[PDB]
Amino acid sequence: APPTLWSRVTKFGSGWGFWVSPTVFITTTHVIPTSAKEFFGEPLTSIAIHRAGEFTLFRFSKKIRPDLTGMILEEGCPEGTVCSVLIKRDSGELLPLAVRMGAIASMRIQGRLVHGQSGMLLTGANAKGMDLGTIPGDCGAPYVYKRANDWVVCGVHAAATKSGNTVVCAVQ
Amino acid sequence: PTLWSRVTKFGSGWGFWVSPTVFITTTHVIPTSAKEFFGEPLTSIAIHRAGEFTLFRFSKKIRPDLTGMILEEGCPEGTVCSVLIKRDSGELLPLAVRMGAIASMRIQGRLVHGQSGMLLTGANAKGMDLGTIPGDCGAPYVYKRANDWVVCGVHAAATKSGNTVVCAVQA
Ligand SMILES: COC(=O)c1ccc2ncccc2c1
């Protein structure tokens, strides 16, 4: 996956978020620090926060990441799309986990009620644990894929079943 | 403690530490000019070759931080393995493969013997991280069985199209 996409993935609360543009940051609602009143030097008064269930978008009034070009963010992807989840792991290791995407779903995972785009990992069978699957520290990592000539972001990592086989992407 | 720490850059590809003293690789990535590997003189290294599978047994513990793993001669037909691909970017690419029969296959002009497999990542890579490249040879094939990780060979070859692969196996 291109270096410019890895540079957009930034450590945030109990997980990660993703710079779509110099002013727009997306992440998974549950990884956000609950009491926080300031982000990237800016007060909450100066930021437009758009919440839809487990998807949160931050739009800043100033350019926080002026090194970046704005890219395409879509509301999920077509059934059958193969995406990469851009997961960073202890020590500059980069894990772009392959996932075949399925339908928008409502599920109960570890007793929590979760709504988003379901998918199934293409890394291995019985992908429970950190070598072939997701861990709770991965929440907020972006779901991306390549079209004709450009890359698209279509959601952020929200949940995984106990078996590890099913993941859920929260969507705009 | 990770499987990934056992995957090691070696000659023109990779290899995998089965135990503190045992390292496995693809025969064609091994240097043809050498007096030592991993600081141990070749004189003290046991080399066991069966076609495109090579095993080294060292007389000293090179990787004393590791426990010994189960090594087998391929796996049952239909097993879904993962090929543990490392890239010089720092990317780790675990790719699912449905394992088939032991076969001889002409892969871009060359005859290669080993366990056939079909990548489960579909279409092509389409310039995504979904297939192998030549520099991936020696990467291990593994799967989880009960609570045990099993390693059943090393990445020997891939078709131009990408979707058929050959895993070289012991004996
Ligand atoms: C054990 O997995 C299957 O039954 C299966 C499923 C999908 C496949 N797709 C391509 C090639 C082979 C495949 C095999």
The 3-class SS string of A136-170 reads HHHCCCEEEEECCCCEEEEEEEEEECCCCCEEEEE
Among residues B11, B16, B53, which one has the least CA distance to residue B31?
A: B11
Pairing of strands A72-73, A151-160: parallel
Angstrom distance (rounded) from CA A51 to CA A53? 6
| 3-class secondary-structure state, position B91 | strand
Signed CA dihedral, A91, A94, A97, A101: sign only: positive
Indicate the burial class of A115 (C-beta count within 10 angstroms; 0-12, 13-18, 19 or more): middle
Residue A17: closest CA among A114, A138, A134, A99: A138
**What's the CA-to-centroid distance between B98 and ligand 1, angstroms?**
6
Residue B144 touches partner A, C-beta closer than 8 Å: yes
CB A20 within 8 A of CB A153: yes
Q: Is B137 an annotated catalytic residue? A: yes
Q: Write the residue in A84, A92, A146 that is nearest to B90 by C-beta.
A: A92
Instruction: Choose, out of B82, B98, B142, B143, the residue to mutate when testing the contact with A (most A CBs < 10 Å).
Output: B82
| Atom from ligand 1 closest to the CA of residue B118 | 11
Q: How far apart, in whole angstroms, are the C-alpha atoms of residue B92 and residue B94?
A: 7
End-to-end CA gap in chain B: 29
Place of tokens 């080399």: B47
Q: How is residue A117 written in tokens?
A: 């785009």
Cα angle value B143/B101/B146 (rounded, 5°): 25
A54 is catalytic: yes
The burial of B56, by beta-carbon neighbours within 10 Å (0-12 exposed, 13-18 middle, 19 or more buried), is given as buried
**Residue A169 contacts B, CB cutoff 8 Å:** no
Residues 6+ apart with CB under 8 A from A72: A150, A151, A152, A153
Q: Are A151 and A145 in contact (CB under 8 A)?
A: yes
Give the bridge partners for B157, in sequence order. B166
CA atoms of B86 and B4, how far apart (whole Å): 8
Give, for ligand 1, the residue of B118, B161, B163 to mutate: max count of ligand atoms closer than 8 Å to Cβ: B118
Name the DSSP class of A69.
Answer: P
Q: How far apart are CA A21 and CA B171, in angstroms?
A: 55
CB of B130 within 8 Å of any CB in chain A?
Answer: yes
What is the enclosing helix (H) or strand (E) of A12?
strand A9-12
By what technique were these coordinates determined? X-ray
